[PDB]
Each structure stands twice: as C-alpha cells, then as structure tokens.
C-alpha cells in the first residue's frame, strides 16, 4: 500500500562519484543531503558544498559555483576557516550503513557538492543525493 | 552529520569458564 | 495520513542501582555534623554483699565530627522557535535526562567517588576488613585463582550480631560462579534444572555491572587460557542501612538562566546538591585476591 | 527553516545513465520513485523493473534481478502483454520536470531499474532515483 | 555555621544474647 512518494518529497542525484550536478531546490523550502557508501572508505572525506545564482544569459540556467558560507549557532565552539558549509564523512563507515545531514539557512537558487581537496580518490566510492520536501510552487 | 543503519555480521560467539 | 500511537521504545540501559540499601538522608544547609561515640567504658565492677563503696570505671568518647556534601550543576541552550514546532516535547526529555544523569552519576560517585568534591565512595576509603581468596599451588607454580570455597569462608565468616548484610558483585562473578562444575562432572550450585537464574530476590545475590569485575570482561581468568590477575575486587558484603549513608538536600532543579537568554536562543542551568560518607565501617567487609 | 530531512526519506541511486543499483528496502515500508532527464529525448522510453532475493551465501546482499509481475487495478483496459510490470516515459519530457511512480505492491528485499532492450540508447539521458518512507527498526 | 542533623553511628557491638532464651521469672526480696 505504499504511497506514490516521488511526488511528496522527491529527489535527484548530487554526486555519483565521479561528477558534481546542480539541483534546483528554489520551487522547495526545505532539503537535505543523504550520503551513501559503495566501497570501505581509507580515510575522512571532506565535502564542500556550493550554492549557485541564475545565470544572467537565462533564469533557469546555472552559473558560478559559489562556495556556502557556514552558520554557526550558540553551541558551536569550533568554527571553521571564517565559516564555510562543510561536511565529512568520518571513517569507519562500511556499505549499507548511510548518512545524512543538512545546511542551517538556505542562500540561492540550486546546491551542489564537490569532494573537498584530498577525498577524491575516496569521494570516488561515495555516492550523494539530495531530497526536498514541502514544496508548494 | 549523523546516521544509523543496522545489517551487522550476528556472528555469535563462546564463553566457555571452566575451572 | 499516517497514525500515530503513544509507544516509545528506549534502549537505554541505566545501571544496577544501589542508592536504596545505603541510609538516606534528607538534610538542610551544608556542614553537617553527628556523633560517633567510640565505645561504652566499662562503668560497674560487679559487688559483694557487704561492702558501701563502689570503684569507677573508664568512660568513652563521643567525637562529634561532621560531614560535607558536593554539588552538581550544568548548562544547556535551545533555539525558541525550533521548541514551539516539531511536536515531540523535547523540553521534558531534557529534564528527564538531566535527572537520569545527575542520578548516575550520584551512583558512581557513591563507589568511586575520589575524594576531592568527590562523594568519597567506600571503594576508594579501603577501610573496610577486606578478605582474599588464597592461590593455589597448580604443578608447582602458585598461581592465583578462586573456587568457591572463598565465597564460602567469605560469606559465612560475617559477625551476625550486625545484622542481614547484603553482598554485590558484577554479574561476571555470577556467571564464573555458575560455570563452576565437581570432579565427577555435575555443577556445584542450586542444580534448578535449567532453572538457577538469577532470582537474587531479597537473599545474598546482587548484580551490578557498573562495577569492576575480576573477569577482565570475559574469558580473562579462570578461562581455559590464562589465570587471573592478583589484588583485584571481587565483591562487597555489608549492612548498607548502618553501613554507608547517602545524604541529599535539593533535588535536580532547573532554571531559565536570565542573561544569556535572547528572543532568538534559550540559555537554562540545572543543580543539586547531594553526598555521602561511611558510617562504621567495621560492618561490612570486602572480597579480593 | 529546512528540517535535517535525511534521517527521513533517504534516497539512492538506481540508475545513473548507465549503470543499474540494487536498493535495499527492507526496514523501509513504502518507496516511490523520480525520474530525470538531462538532455532532449529522442522517443518514448520503457524501463524494466526487477527484484531481488538474498542469495543464499550472504542475507544482506541481493541475489538475481528476478522480473517483477505487473498488478491491476480495478477498471483496467489493457494488461502488458507478458504481465511483468514496466514504467514508460513519453517523448517531450524536458529536463526540468521530474517525473513520479510507484509499484502497488512489492515483492522482495532489493528493487532494480534496468534499460528496456531498444530503448537503451536514450538511457544515457535518464537517471532514476529511489526514496523511501518507513523506518520500523 | 555548622549544621546539625539528627543521627548519630554507634559502630559497638554487645554480643549474641542468650537471656532470652532461659525461663524469665521476676522476683522481689532476696532468698527465693
């Protein structure tokens, strides 16, 4: 009896290993990122996140990557280089075992991730998706 | 930054106290 | 529309507790202090029928001495919005496990609680007459071990006269005890078909995993691979109600810290206020290698 | 305000282009489904959806990709010609407008989209992924 | 200031008695 769940709360692919993608997310007002692992990881793998703009040549087309800036909040005590959204995936995270997380405060239209320098080679065994919700157009 | 999942090896295991 | 019950599964093992053998105490302002007369002189001699004159006796002390208490106290913040939405109180679940903590941690404190704002926990005070089980010369080596005729000299050899002292372990010991079996290959221990298990109602058997074990976990000593280690606890066997005392003055209160606290973020700070002490320590008595 | 909504609804790959992913769904109790294209399309395009068992050697990995048999509902007019239940895609599906399924009634513990012969072509073009609703464990 | 509590530790020990158990009888002036 499961529900037709693609509509009410979709998803797309944000990073299948080799390549990052833009995902719009401005017809939504809340999203996350889910990660998951195909192969044992060697290391912690570092990923940046990227909010983009829309390209002035079209509305709907993407343009720069700009980087997120990090949001702290009052129990942080351990910011980051001036603050920029940054996540890691730690080791000692085998197949079929997932994660997830989110950004505080949405800025832009679209996101997307990239493997943050030195986890490439480990941002090859990890795939990234991202999934909306509350949409109302 | 956080996740669960389940799936371990059960993999039982032995106690044995003798004397 | 999904449905919505009012179960919730916890999987949230506390510990085995002991805060209800030891003397409770509810008390006021810090500092306390009590008596704790040293013996009863011998006053009288005795008299024969004759004489009208007596001959005195030596008398006691009382050594009024006194005892202080520590606290406890923690922080925690909440965004203000975030608590109005997303059903699920989490406002309550933070009281409910910030008393959970502050009783934990109360029990730990009580056993080992080292001294210095510490609640000095009778581990840690030694002062009790502790007994050791003795080695055992296997192929000429001596090496430690323990059979259960420790227990058996450990237990029996109580003075009475204090009264029903109760006696913990960890659960280790239960289990080694229980996997101790005769020459001719039958166990030694209750023989309930299947049934021993750990009853441990009221009578001289109580678990506490939050204490040391002399196993090293498991398979560490007494395995079929190698013995135990010497000088390690085994068990603890004394009338807690006269033994050792808890003393509480405040329960766990909380607070919305004033000044720190925004129309955006929540700043709050609980406390209690809660120690202990050893009452005569000649009551009880311990168990080791 | 977007809640941390990868601890719910956690998607993963299927199909990317040109390679098929085995999705497990057992904890989970309903799944959807979102399909993407990233370029124009040529024609139509059916996919083959496929199910899996735990082979017998290991209980947490999936076994063949085993046929999944087509269900109807009440007031039905047609019924695939060998009953084995497939999604179609019709042409003119521009890249900016995902598309949504579900299969009525599952059957197995891993779910699977393959590229139906013919229409492989234009697969390079799809990527279909896969969210799911429960947790129950 | 100090505070006082109400308990006091005894930490002596009598014996086991054994009055209990022989016949108890009161009496009065000597030579029953």
New interface residues.
Partial sequence: MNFNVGVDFPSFIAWDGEESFPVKVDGFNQFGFTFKTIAALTAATTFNIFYHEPSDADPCVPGPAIRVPEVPFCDTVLLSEDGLAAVTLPETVTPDSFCAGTVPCMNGQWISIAPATGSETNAANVQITVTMKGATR | MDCRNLCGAAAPSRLVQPG | TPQVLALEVDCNIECASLLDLY?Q?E??????????????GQLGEYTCDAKCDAEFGEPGNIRHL?GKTYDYRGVF?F?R??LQE?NYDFLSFMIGAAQRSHRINRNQALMIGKGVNEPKGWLTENCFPVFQTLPVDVNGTSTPAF?AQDWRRFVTSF????GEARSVMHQNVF??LA???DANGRFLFGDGDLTFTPDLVRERIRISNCLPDP?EG??KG???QDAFAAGSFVAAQAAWK?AF?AVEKRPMFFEQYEGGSSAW?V?YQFGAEDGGFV??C??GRILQI
Same sequence: chains 1, 4.
């Fill in positions: 003397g105490i008390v006021s302002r810090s500092t306390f202090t009590y008596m704790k007369i040293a013996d009863y006194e913040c965004n919005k975030n997303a059979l003075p009475a006269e204090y289990g080694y996997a101790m079996v196993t498991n398979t007494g395995t079929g006269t005392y973020c700043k009452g005569c000649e009551h």
